[PDB]
Amino acid sequence: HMVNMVSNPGFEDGLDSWQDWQQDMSAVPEAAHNGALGLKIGGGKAAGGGQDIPLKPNTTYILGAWAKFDSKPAGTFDVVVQYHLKDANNTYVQHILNFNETDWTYKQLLFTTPDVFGSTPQLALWKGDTSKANLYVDDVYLVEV
């Protein structure tokens, strides 16, 4: 843990640097874990957003995040680093944190990138749950160790 690769990782600059795929995202105080703002992804449909992050090859990273649903979900909220390999079929690979908690929860995983990327890595915040539960996420981490 030295440098955070994620731009606008605490949503303190609103939605700056975050793609909004289903127009279901807002940066609002009610969703804050730290600072003034957090990301709210509205319940009722599957929705999310993300950021393209070029990574170094052959390198070990920690992916981490804080999340909570404001109500018991049926599915999960997922934070993912995803990219294609450069191989026989360009395998798609996903390093996935799953959340279903209604208290602020920090989760983290470790992964090591391939020698060659088949595509540019993407950090996705994917609230696949389809209940009425709203999802809060804040303080996302992607750091080389």
Ligand X SMILES: OC[C@H]1O[C@@H](O[C@H]2[C@H](O)[C@H](O)[C@H](O[C@H]3[C@H](O)[C@H](O)[C@H](O[C@H]4[C@H](O)[C@H](O)[C@H](O[C@H]5[C@H](O)[C@H](O)[C@H](O)O[C@@H]5CO)O[C@@H]4CO)O[C@@H]3CO)O[C@@H]2CO)[C@@H](O)[C@@H](O)[C@@H]1O
Q: Which of 4, 8, 82, 105 binds ligand X (CB under 6 A)?
A: 82
Min dist. Cβ of residue 138 to Ca ion (A): 4
Lay out the sheet containing 19-20: strands in order across: 19-20, 47-52, 122-127, 77-84, 92-99
CA–CA separation, 106 vs 36, rounded Å? 18
The continuous run of DSSP H or E covering 110 comes out as strand 105-112
- Is residue 48 within 8 Å of residue 129, measured between CB atoms? no
Q: What single-letter amino acid sits at 35?
A: G
Could you tell me which stretch among 1-9, 65-73, 83-91, 121-129 binds ligand X (CB under 6 A)? 121-129
Q: Least distance from C-beta 35 to ligand X, angstroms? A: 25
Is 48 annotated for ligand binding? no
State yes or no: 101 annotated in a binding site: no
How far apart, in whole angstroms, are the C-alpha atoms of residue 121 and residue 129?
A: 23
In angstroms, what is the minimal distance from the CB of 81 to Ca ion? Answer: 20
Interface with ligand X includes 138 (CB under 6 A)?
no
- The residues that touch Ca ion, with contacts defined as CB under 5 A, are 10, 34-35, 37, 138
What residues are designated binding site for Ca(2+)? 10, 12, 34, 37, 138
